[PDB]
């Protein structure tokens, strides 16, 4: 009798607003341009499924349309926050050794997880054997670099779709977004852009976690009296 | 249970159908969030192909009217001693300054490049700019 | 009256620079491994130039130098490849140290 009211006021309520956590104020088209989020790889490296998000090629250097990145990034930040508000397990993945330390720290700060190392076969599809039969897999995976060190898609992108886990990914002009649920077209190479993505996902997650403690405190306080 | 058919449909379609069939007793956590705020494109796997024959990519080059001016400035003079500062967003290079004057003089009514180009260099020399031609 | 993305791209220093071939830029050293000097110059990738022999001591993290860019991204397609092979760095020459 109390679970229905508890569920509706807490879980269903945020799903009724377009922007419950107000993540659109965390960034802007100019904040992305100053971080070189629009700079893509060269034309010869261009992937076919990334053409829709390419504004053009200036001197054989593809330019990512930041107007679409904002709309795509708004949906990823909203989806990321709603899963942290729902007490879901978020996992960060990136095989770029230059940013391995930065990402591992962010996950620790936001009380989340990270996997920046060599991805052993079966971490997801054969998890119960590696970890244990009562293990709980992630509810959301965030790819800061969808490619491995041989310029090919990360194996987790395919393994996540097998286990029905939604993925958020930063796809550059030489990546494959077909199996990525919420892709964000932007530069994934320069350090000035990676620090932004981490700063944005670290903030959206920290907000949702604190936003639920306020909603629960009110419900608990109101419930007693 | 579940369905590991990553190529068939998407995680939403594969999960929406199994829940409605009765296989999945409880819908996953992310499901209610995806149905409310879905992405622009359904994440369906599609195999990449090669273009053959006369097919080509719709991507176009990013050219401007002032690129003709820059090409000539760099040819006549070339990059000067001044080094670019790409960090500074509101940075103006010696060539860019030449374009602003060249365009401003175009508003006056001159319709030829040779005279208009020559007059632009003189204005900068009057302002103190150093313009060493390749010759 | 919010600025659009087409206006940012037109007036950006990189855009107006044009072909990077033989362009003088100013970089910043952010990582040093042995003699190798990893330099950022406001581009997508960095460039790795070797420590000069004449005066190496002055080249520490934060030092700002002068470069002559040759390419913004080293790419090439070889026999049998379906896409270009990129090295994930730029090609530049370390001229000296910037002094104001």
């Amino acid at each position: 009798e109390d679970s229905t009211d508890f569920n509706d006021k807490i879980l269903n309520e945020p799903l009724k607003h377009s922007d419950f956590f107000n993540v659109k104020e965390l960034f802007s088209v100019r904040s992305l341009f100053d971080a070189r989020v629009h700079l893509g790889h060269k034309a010869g490296c261009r992937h076919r499924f990334m053409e829709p998000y390419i504004f053009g090629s200036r001197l054989d250097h593809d330019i990512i349309d930041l107007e679409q990145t904002a709309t795509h990034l708004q949906l990823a930040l909203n989806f990321t926050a709603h899963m942290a508000y729902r007490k879901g397990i978020i996992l960060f993945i990136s095989r770029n050794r230059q940013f391995s330390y930065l990402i591992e720290n962010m996950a620790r700060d936001c009380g989340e997880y990270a996997h920046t190392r060599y991805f052993r076969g079966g971490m997801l599809t054969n998890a119960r054997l590696l970890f244990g039969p009562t293990v709980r897999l992630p509810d959301l995976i965030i790819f800061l670099h969808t490619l491995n060190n041989i310029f090919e898609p990360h194996v987790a992108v395919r393994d996540a779709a097998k286990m029905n886990i939604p993925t958020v990914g930063i796809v550059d002009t030489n990546c494959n977004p077909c199996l990525i649920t919420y892709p964000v077209p932007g530069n994934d190479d320069s350090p000035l852009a990676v620090h932004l993505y981490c700063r944005l996902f670290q903030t959206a997650i920290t907000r949702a976690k604190e936003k639920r403690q306020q909603v629960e405190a009110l419900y608990r306080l109101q419930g007693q009296k | 249970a579940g369905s590991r058919l990553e190529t068939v449909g998407s995680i939403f379609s594969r999960t929406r159908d199994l829940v409605r069939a009765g296989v999945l007793k409880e819908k996953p956590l992310w499901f209610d969030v995806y149905d409310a705020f879905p992405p622009l494109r359904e994440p369906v796997f599609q195999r990449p192909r090669v273009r053959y024959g006369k097919a080509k990519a719709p991507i176009q080059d990013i050219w401007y009217h002032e690129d003709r001016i820059r090409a000539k400035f760099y040819s006549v003079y070339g990059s000067g001693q001044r080094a670019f500062d790409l960090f500074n967003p509101n940075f103006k290079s010696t060539c860019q300054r030449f374009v602003e004057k060249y365009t401003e003089l175009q508003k006056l009514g001159e319709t030829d490049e040779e005279k208009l180009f020559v007059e632009t260099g003189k204005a900068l020399l009057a302002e103190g700019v150093i313009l060493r031609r390749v010759g | 009256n919010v600025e659009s993305f087409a206006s940012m791209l037109r007036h950006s220093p990189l855009t107006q620079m044009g072909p990077a071939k033989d362009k003088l830029v100013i970089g910043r050293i952010f990582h040093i491994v042995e003699n190798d000097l990893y330099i950022d110059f406001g581009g997508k990738f960095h460039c790795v130039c070797r420590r000069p022999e004449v005066d190496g001591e002055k080249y520490q993290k934060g030092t700002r130098v002068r470069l002559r860019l040759l390419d913004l991204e080293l790419t090439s397609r070889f026999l049998g490849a379906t896409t270009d092979t990129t090295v994930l760095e730029a090609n530049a020459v370390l001229l000296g140290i910037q002094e104001s």
Binding site: - | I62, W63, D67, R68, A71, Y74 | -
Partner: peptide, 26 residues
């Protein structure tokens, strides 16, 4: 509409084609 959009133009920075030492000679 907007005036900052790019235009359909040929490459201005394109360099002339190279020639052999004997180009134009008998």
């Amino acid at each position: 509409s907007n005036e900052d959009l790019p235009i359909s133009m040929e490459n201005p920075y394109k360099e002339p084609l190279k020639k052999c030492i004997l180009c134009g000679k008998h």
